[PDB]
């Protein structure tokens, strides 16, 4: 009968092309991954420029100057915090993937801040496994033109779907019907791409409210 629009954010950095001239295969693998990541960000930006009316209304609230920095302020130390919109609407906010933290701290200092020399293949595979989710999110958004249903595992995993069930404004008997039927509350959910502004990628997930 009712939806529950959450906000899922990803910290997306912007890295200029690394001027490294490296013939090592491990350097080239990381450069290929970075060129795939930058192309994913560019394609995600290119997308932005009915059961989705409740999720678009949050996409346009974040279109205001002074609404995405408040969402960043709240998550500044917590992965799941409640923020207040300009309309007074309370919206759960979730930070799933920190790609800015990984790229700025581990990759950039040893690749572009100095002459490139990568000593580990573990970080090549580790980057490939965390950047992989971002590439899949772009693939489901580019094919479906920004609105993805049924809700996939890449957008919202099962571990992070029971977190937005115990944190919902419903009774403890309606959180029993949805925590035991995860595979049914995923075919009736949505995912709307909202914005890439101020180095943050945010999309809205509409989990349903079963009031009957």
């Amino acid at each position, epitope marked *: 009968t009712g939806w529950y629009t959450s906000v899922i954010t990803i910290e997306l950095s912007n890295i200029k092309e690394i001027k490294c001239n490296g013939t090592d295969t491990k350097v080239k693998l990381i450069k290929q991954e970075l060129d795939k990541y930058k192309n994913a960000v560019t394609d995600l930006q290119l997308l932005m420029q009915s059961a989705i009316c409740s999720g678009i209304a949050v996409c346009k609230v974040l279109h205001l100057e002074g609404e995405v920095n408040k969402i960043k302020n709240a998550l*500044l130390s917590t992965n799941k915090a409640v923020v207040s919109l*300009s309309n007074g609407v309370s919206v759960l906010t979730f930070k799933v993937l920190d790609l800015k933290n990984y790229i700025n701290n581990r990759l950039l200092p040893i690749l572009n801040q100095q002459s490139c020399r990568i000593p580990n293949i573990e970080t090549v595979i580790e980057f490939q496994q965390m950047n992989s989710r971002l590439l899949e999110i772009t693939r489901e958004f580019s094919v479906n033109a920004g609105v993805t249903t049924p809700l996939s595992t890449y957008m919202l995993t099962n571990s992070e779907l029971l977190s937005l069930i115990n944190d919902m404004p419903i009774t403890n008997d309606q959180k029993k019907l949805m925590s035991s039927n995860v595979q049914i509350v995923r075919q009736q959910s949505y995912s709307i791409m909202c914005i890439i502004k101020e180095e943050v990628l945010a999309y809205v997930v509409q989990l349903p409210i079963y009031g009957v």
Partner: antibody
Amino acid sequence: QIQLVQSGPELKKPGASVKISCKASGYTFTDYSMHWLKQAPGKGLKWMGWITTETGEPTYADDFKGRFAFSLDTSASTAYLQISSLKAEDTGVYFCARYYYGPFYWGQGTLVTVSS
Amino acid sequence: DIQMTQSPSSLSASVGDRVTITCRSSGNIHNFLTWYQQKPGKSPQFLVYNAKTLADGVPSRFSGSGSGTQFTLTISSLQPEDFGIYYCQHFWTTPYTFGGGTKVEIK
């Protein structure tokens, strides 16, 4: 390591114009918009509005309309402030600011002095 | 427009005092407050991210607490390196308004 470098002081006449530049180096200029903050002489701080560094559409506060216009050149990574039809209290210090995680990040001071 | 005010517009503490600087608001702002420390003839650097989080590079002596329509900035123990004019500015919604400005003097 985000840096906002601004212009220097100017000394003008009532009716002249002042062109204040604010160069933002350290981040992709398209992401964050530019906010302008006027300090009154001896008084508190005033907030005029922001200029979107992606589209270029400015918005002003109800007190700062009529003589103030924001402009920018996205290729040079600079933000421009032009004051036309000058008067004698436009004087003070002018700041260019961008959003940090919450509060503002402020530029330096470009004192504007109106003589007679 | 949410309008802010500060009670101790002229504060003069000693070198070992614990002072409180407060703000009100005409409207309700949900834990969206920041404090600036404008040195005399320079640019105002913030000290607090949200009303209960000190900024990076800011001494832990600075701390804030409050939500709704009443806030407070607390200095655990003053030191001579910290003196200036303090402003508290909401960023809930536009236009943003600053406080009257507290000139923390020295006793």
